[PDB]
Swiss-Prot record, chain A:
Self-assembles to form an icosahedral capsid with a T=16 symmetry, about 200 nm in diameter, and consisting of 150 hexons and 12 pentons (total of 162 capsomers). Hexons form the edges and faces of the capsid and are each composed of six MCP molecules. In contrast, one penton is found at each of the 12 vertices. Eleven of the pentons are MCP pentamers, while the last vertex is occupied by the portal complex. It comes from Human herpesvirus 2 (strain HG52). The chain holds residues 347 to 393 of 1374 of the full protein. Disulfide bonds: none annotated. It comes from the Viruses. The lineage of its organism: Viruses, Duplodnaviria, Heunggongvirae, Peploviricota, Herviviricetes. This is Major capsid protein. It is found in: Virion; Host nucleus. Homomultimer. Makes the hexons and eleven out of twelve pentons. Interacts with triplex proteins 1/TRX1 and 2/TRX2; adjacent capsomers are linked together in groups of three by triplexes, heterotrimeric complexes composed of one molecule of TRX1 and two molecules of TRX2. Interacts with scaffold protein; this interaction allows efficient MCP transport to the host nucleus. Interacts with capsid vertex component 2/CVC2. Interacts with the small capsomere-interacting protein/SCP. Belongs to the herpesviridae major capsid protein family.
Curated annotation (Swiss-Prot), chain B:
Belongs to the herpesviridae major capsid protein family. Self-assembles to form an icosahedral capsid with a T=16 symmetry, about 200 nm in diameter, and consisting of 150 hexons and 12 pentons (total of 162 capsomers). Hexons form the edges and faces of the capsid and are each composed of six MCP molecules. In contrast, one penton is found at each of the 12 vertices. Eleven of the pentons are MCP pentamers, while the last vertex is occupied by the portal complex. It is found in: Virion; Host nucleus. This is Major capsid protein. The lineage of its organism: Viruses, Duplodnaviria, Heunggongvirae, Peploviricota, Herviviricetes. Homomultimer. Makes the hexons and eleven out of twelve pentons. Interacts with triplex proteins 1/TRX1 and 2/TRX2; adjacent capsomers are linked together in groups of three by triplexes, heterotrimeric complexes composed of one molecule of TRX1 and two molecules of TRX2. Interacts with scaffold protein; this interaction allows efficient MCP transport to the host nucleus. Interacts with capsid vertex component 2/CVC2. Interacts with the small capsomere-interacting protein/SCP. The chain holds residues 100 to 148 of 1374 of the full protein. The gene is MCP.
C-alpha cells in the first residue's frame, strides 16, 4: 500500500558540546582524533 | 591515577592502577661578593673626617 508508518521521537535533549566541524563540499562532517580524549593513558592501541 | 577501557573477550582483564613516586629536592647555593677598600671604610664609619 502506502505505509510510511515509522514513528518519530520526542525531540530529546539538545546540549552544546565542543566538537569539531568541517565541511567537505555538500556534506558536513566531524573530525575526530581520539588519542588524547579516550586513549591517553589507557594502554590499548589505537585501532 | 589512570583510567582503563574494558576489553571484549579473549584478553586479560584490565584492572585500574595508581602510580606514586616522590621526588627529592635539589639544593644549591649562589655565591656573590662585593668588597670595600681600607680608606673607604674610615670615611663612611666616621672617625676619619
Amino acid at each position: 500500500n502506502r505505509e510510511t508508518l515509522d514513528e518519530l521521537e520526542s525531540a530529546p535533549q539538545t546540549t552544546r558540546v565542543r566538537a569539531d566541524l568541517v565541511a567537505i563540499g555538500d556534506r558536513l562532517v566531524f573530525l575526530e582524533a581520539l588519542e588524547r580524549r579516550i586513549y591517553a593513558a589507557t594502554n590499548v592501541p589505537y585501532p | 591515577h589512570q583510567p582503563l577501557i574494558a576489553r571484549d573477550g579473549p584478553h586479560p582483564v584490565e584492572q585500574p592502577v595508581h602510580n606514586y613516586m616522590t621526588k627529592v629536592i635539589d639544593r644549591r647555593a649562589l655565591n656573590a661578593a662585593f668588597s670595600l677598600a681600607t680608606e673607604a671604610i674610615a670615611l663612611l664609619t666616621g672617625e676619619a673626617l
